[model samples]
Target: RRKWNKTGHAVRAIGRLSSLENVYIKADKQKNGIKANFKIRHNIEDGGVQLAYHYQQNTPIGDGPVLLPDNHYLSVQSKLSKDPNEKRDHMVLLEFVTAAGITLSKGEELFTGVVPILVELDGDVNGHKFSVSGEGEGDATYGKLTLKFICTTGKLPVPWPTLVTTLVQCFSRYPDHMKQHDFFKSAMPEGYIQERTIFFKDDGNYKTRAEVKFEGDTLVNRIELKGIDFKEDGNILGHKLEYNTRDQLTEEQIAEFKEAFSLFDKDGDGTITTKELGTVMRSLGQNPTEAELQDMINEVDADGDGTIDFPEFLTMMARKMKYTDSEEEIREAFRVFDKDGNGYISAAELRHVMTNLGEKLTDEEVDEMIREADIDGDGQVNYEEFVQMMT
Candidate 1:
């Protein structure tokens, strides 16, 4: 009907940063609360300027985004956006209350003014520790409206990406306000951007402004970690190796790949051939055909040598090593409601549980959940359908 199909009416676009680049933003302080603002690098054609964005809390993010509003009491699905079309860009200006607010329907529940963004990166990303050049370098609470985290994801909806991006939603009054899990302990115990305080100690790089703009449709800019003149001949295949693929992975994970690589490189040629790769695949309980093997080789063989090297193999592994919630846990939760032990939950069983063990709901409301989860147009929810719904 119209050429607007490219982006539809709303100005919703997402782009991954080459490295975690600090986005300069504004948080307008209002009478009751504050609204977080971001300057998007895209133009919103003629329209009412209704904008929104999607983000996640982790990197190498999963295919399905789990609803994270469990704490903030609002849907983390998308946040509010605003105008910058005049400036050839757009903005996301939404009123976000504190982690602990007065619990109002419209976020009118009063609290402190500006919301805080706390980014927790690994203690050591490769050899060098990474923190935003912006932020207090002392306390993140005293920093800009925006912060950055290393994000990466693969496949579907928006697959034209070289790296994963997790555009986070929700807030915390401070990092310490949300206690760290029992398993997780940071190198810098003094939270609220602990790395910011440690890595760039004494710099106190406050009020640093960096303009972020997407020059093209798919942007993957080289974020010079600021020390560049000391470099010479720093690229191989397609990646700027020894640093690019090197930064995103952890120690044990990389070691694991090294073992797999050496094992698969049976001839010890440091590269995996088609038969070599196919052998390893079969050994690992997969039955890939010749076509599948070719597809795998072509997917990662950047040099077009019809074979994969260490970097390419590691890159493929890293790209595919995304995190997902425990299906075991999903099954456990599903079992709680799968009253009949039939591997499927029907409306009557769900209604029985909800009306007694859970929230009492109208038959209409009860069946609505089943209808949403029933993917095959079946009247009941099977295990696969349950898994899909859970995701």
Candidate 2:
């Protein structure tokens, strides 16, 4: 636990400025060379007194103006930090030598260093261009004299454009309301954050339980372009409009719904009564409560006629299940319903398919199914009709 606490402390300190995580420097003067690697550490609890570093340095072989000792090296114990405000303080120390192992300059200290932080943001972020600059100075005192220099720029991490774009969009859409939600405020493209209640038209069972309440009368937020069931009054009835996770049907596909309508229009009245609809549900092995049945009826009965007309039935059924845009999927479903490979579902074929699924519908029920889906009074369900009905 103690080691864990220390590790956490080290991480927190390093996180202060990500750009300062690891640093490397190499310099060559005259015939001598120097290379150093620095890893900095600081902890708030330890205060600035213990703030320090672990480092290593060595001179590589190179033919130059100055001579370097063959055995010269620096271990991790070399001091690399001191109070910047203190006069004549040594933040970093170095030594100079010659090839014959003769010392030219020893105990050379980088005196009272001045440090400055700088940030720079660039690129066309919707056309706002700017830059940041800072300056700091320090000197190296060689015996009786000091050599001074200035650093004009410093370091900071780059800004994320994607994150800025997302926030901008979110704010534009809901300037007053966005501040109320943390999700839109904490948009960080550099990190991975699981978006809660990301509304998507999915299959009924795969719903996100996060507290993304219904917007107005629909499951979709008003600003969202994609939604599952958009109603006339923006409200839904019965399990949020069947949770169909497919895009809206094409004109050609929508035209086929007439064939499906015929299958439920018992009594050949061009409309489906609640009783007739209930019977079809029972055939499918569903036992919706009377209240549920009433809600179902009211949902599709747009005219409030206590029954579903072909147009109303088509609308309701379209949203009942997800329909694929794939012609192959539609063809496969047609083939399954067309058991005899005749490319059409005759009354007998419909009955056979139902029986195979353990739903042994009576002959009258099969006839009713045909009447409902056979839009042109053809007495059979064709490929177009089958695709429309299932999808």
Candidate 3:
């Protein structure tokens, strides 16, 4: 985490990227901190061995310790030069190297901990220039500079990170007009061009798409992409088109539906009422209302029958999922909705649990859901009916 002083106030820890597969960024505060642990390595005959370990106490800012390099021998070597001034400088450099620290300033220093710089480069071997981003507090500065990188003329399979850094460092050298054509408006995978397309969903909302387009050499230019909804949910929600190159969610979503046929088929008998839904919810620490229970049954029971059976149940479910899910992620979702610890879910259990999660059901919606579950009206849900509904 890092802080910035802007508008005359300190903005501390504005964001973070966690180690978990799931990433969360804080808009308001930075609560997570980085810590430092030090290990000393000794060169052995075949392998390196750790000679010592040290851990510094945590600080309020929470960053790990940064190590400094030792330069004692080089310092002494400097003194041997005809220019004694340069020789003394060399001795000082050698002594500094042995100290294990980084140059925070021309002379000042820190014993340990990270040096937070907003922009970092692999090296300074070339004359290319890029200004730094982090604030020069102690010895560190932060921030980024935009740079133009011509991947083709420079090399094949670009040393991407190095290129990004070099351009950033040389940012001040470029003119404003160049910035406009140098980068992408959205994140794009490296070494690929993206084709854009529009899509119209069942709900009438328009969506966009980004697809990788590549062909052998000639510095590939221009692309044509066709939008196709490959899965039920994908056609409905446009989930595939929402995220750019980043694996990010465009909106908050939750999975709530369970198999409807499985809900009533609990006791191995296919039919259910409020009492059964209430029972299932009770196990999960909830209770269903009279309206909630009735709506659930009415929606899933498509045939106008008071009870629902297998075939009709499967058909109904397919339609709803087709209209509300993403094409690529629908199958895993089907598995998720059938949540009874068993292969299928029942209407009673579905309504009871879903209502608790804030999904309001209509009488028609309930009947439709049941018909999607109950394929045969034996008044019970069976494994075959459950499988059919999910399929």
Candidate 4:
């Protein structure tokens, strides 16, 4: 059970590369754990540095209380740093590290040429796992950052309260463009020149080849150049492609989804009907019609039960969230379509699913679909077969 909640806001800034004092940060920790302020001030060109431009940004750390426990995820939002008329290139990245210099989470490079920068971090420390996401306030100067901690494996370490403070300190230490480039140079593989290819996902779409290195599980440095030929003096093209580090669901996300399901399961039947969904949406300040609600249900109620189980609900959300869900999530979705909970989808179940989705397929069409995926001639699609067919 989580009982402690701490909230505050802070500011961070970066200065010219020539100066050793290139960054500054300030934050306030509130007692009620409701609000915190942060500011980042990037000093413009002062003297010999002659840095091209300066940037300043404000971030609110943990919109509400810093929840205790482990495996809870947080969400926060920040205002875009770039002005409407500014023609400068903009990049935003998050680095999560410990006081002992152990990097925990590294966020992807976000090209925020738009408004309301969103930040989410998912990672595990010791036995604790947590996530954070941010949403900038309408005022444009501040944002709401939510933190969720879940104690799945064990309790938070004794020094867990200082984690956010350490995060702010790490934010202060973030490098400027020149220093970032310098780190890239020092981190590159030796004699490694060539526009080599590196594939991250098992799927296609190769980005670039770079001998990357990680500090702990978080990526600290990497270097990749465009020129194919080995270059002693060749300029560094890029380093470290952004990556999503979540391999499983943080405990917070699971709790949130389950709670959300309960909200829509009006009868406590462990399933959500079309009417229930519409009513729940309305209660949540949404105006969904019967047709719309049915459409929504038909879209994700994979089992064709005319109602949504927990797995179906998760599947619907996983589709809407757009984040890569973990394998457990996918398995949950499969379970929904396997209405019998038998770990396999029979021909009848497949047909029902198609019918629910507004596809009036004949028995042959449904059987053919199953046959294509039923590799073992078992006359049924197992979880793996179902996933392949769906995916």
Please write out the lDDT profile of model 1 over residues 203-228, one tens digit for every residue. Answer: 11111111111123111112212111
Worst 10 residues of 2 by lDDT: 161-170
* TM-score of candidate 2 to 2 decimals: 0.25
lDDT (10s digit) by residue, model 4, range 294-354: 6555444444456678775664443233222234544655654577889998988766644
lDDT of each: 0.33, 0.33, 0.27, 0.34
Count of clashing pairs, candidate 4: 39
Report the poorest 10 consecutive residues by lDDT, candidate 1.
Answer: 9-18
Q: Which stretches of candidate 1 lie over 4 Å from their true place?
A: 1-248, 284-286, 325-391
Task: Candidate 4: list runs displaced more than 4 Å.
Answer: 1-30, 35-322
Models 1 onward score TM values of 0.25, 0.25, 0.22, 0.29
Give candidate 3's TM-score: 0.22
Local error of candidate 4 at 376, Å?
Answer: 3.5
Ranking by lDDT: 4, 1, 2, 3
lDDT of 2 by residue, 55-86 (tens): 32222222222222222211111112234563
Candidate 2, superposed: residue stretches over 4 Å from native: 1-255, 317-352, 355-391
